[PDB]
Structure formats: structure tokens, C-alpha cells
Design a protein around this ligand. Structure first.
Ligand SMILES: O=C(O)CCCN1CCc2[nH]c(=O)c3cc(F)ccc3c2C1
Length: 165
């Protein structure tokens, strides 16, 4: 056996951002940043040819909803890309055809920032302001809609993934 090491910590809290125009000072409430570095996940209907080329871009870093509680409760264009600590959350997202695997520094830990009592606390969300560059996307597994399971012989690694720890 061996114990795992601790995580590298970047000076820039949005080092991972695909759109660096995000304005960290506009995040509300005061963000509690994720300091661990385990694999995160994102269910997305968008296909890997697009995600591996572009990363995950946020819908609106200029005029989107910077309030985290508002964004979580009421789907609204935002500067954030949502991810989760829960490998299996894809099973709750109907028609989301893929489960993406993410190895990225930082992100706002939603439940640490807004509490763990809100309606969607069981999503155990990490919100990436400015999104996530492709170098931090490990790969993807497509999801069989009828059984809500991953089609593991059809997983694909991202050629642009750059391990960093
Ligand atoms: O995502 C958009 O662009 C807007 C539509 C809404 N989505 C799509 C997909 C998706 N995937 C996730 O894994 C996830 C994980 C979370 F913890 C919280 C939210 C999500 C969402 C929310």
C-alpha cells in the first residue's frame, strides 16, 4: 500500500479557465475554492470532437449570472462550467450522452460556498469560473440512455490531456 500525496496549488485560482476574461471578483458569495485534485466529472450532451478541441467554455463570462446560488437553483447563462465530485451523477441527467472525466486544478466548491442544505446539494458540484481548458479534460465515456450506464468499450481519451500531478 501507499498513501497519496497532497495536491499542487496554483497562484491563479482560475488557472484552468478556457475563457480567462472571467472576473473572479464578481463571484458571489465569497467562493470557497476546491483544494483537492481528484478526478471530477461532467455529464454533457456535447460530443468529444468539440470538447477535446475547445475544452468546456462557459456560456457568458461577460453578462452571465455570477451568483452561484442563483445559477444552481435557476438554470441561467453563467461564467461557470459545472462539474461534480460524483462519478455517477450522469445517471440523473437524462439525454446527457457523455460522462467526461476532468483533472483540473481549482474550481469553486459549491456546497462549501453556499452550504449543503440547498435543493441540489446532492450534486456535489464544483463550478469552474471561465470553464476548463482541454488540457485538463482526461477523456469521456458515452452513456447508454436506456440503462444509464457507461459504454466502457467506447470511452475515448483526450489527445490533449496534460497530466500535472
Ligand atoms: O451545462 C450547461 O451548459 C447548462 C445546462 C445544465 N447542465 C448541464 C450539464 C451538467 N452536467 C453536470 O455534470 C453537472 C454537474 C453538476 F454538479 C451540476 C450541474 C451539471 C450540469 C448542468
Amino acid at each position: 500500500k501507499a498513501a497519496a500525496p497532497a495536491c499542487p496549488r496554483f497562484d491563479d485560482p482560475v488557472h484552468a479557465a478556457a475563457d480567462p476574461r472571467v472576473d473572479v471578483e464578481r463571484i458571489t458569495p465569497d467562493p470557497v475554492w476546491r483544494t483537492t485534485c481528484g478526478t471530477l466529472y461532467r455529464s454533457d450532451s456535447r460530443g468529444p470532437a468539440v470538447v477535446f478541441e475547445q475544452g468546456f467554455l462557459p456560456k457568458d463570462v461577460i453578462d452571465g449570472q455570477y451568483d452561484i446560488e442563483s445559477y444552481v437553483l435557476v438554470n441561467q447563462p453563467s461564467p461557470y462550467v459545472s462539474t461534480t465530485y460524483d462519478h455517477d451523477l450522469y445517471k440523473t441527467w437524462y439525454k446527457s450522452g457523455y460522462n467526461y472525466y476532468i483533472d483540473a486544478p481549482g474550481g469553486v466548491d459549491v456546497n462549501k460556498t453556499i452550504g449543503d442544505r440547498h435543493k441540489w446539494a446532492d450534486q456535489v458540484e464544483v463550478a469552474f469560473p471561465g470553464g476548463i481548458r482541454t488540457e485538463f479534460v482526461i477523456g469521456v465515456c458515452p452513456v447508454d440512455k436506456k440503462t444509464r450506464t457507461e459504454k466502457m468499450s467506447e470511452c475515448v481519451g483526450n489527445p490533449h490531456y496534460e497530466p500535472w500531478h
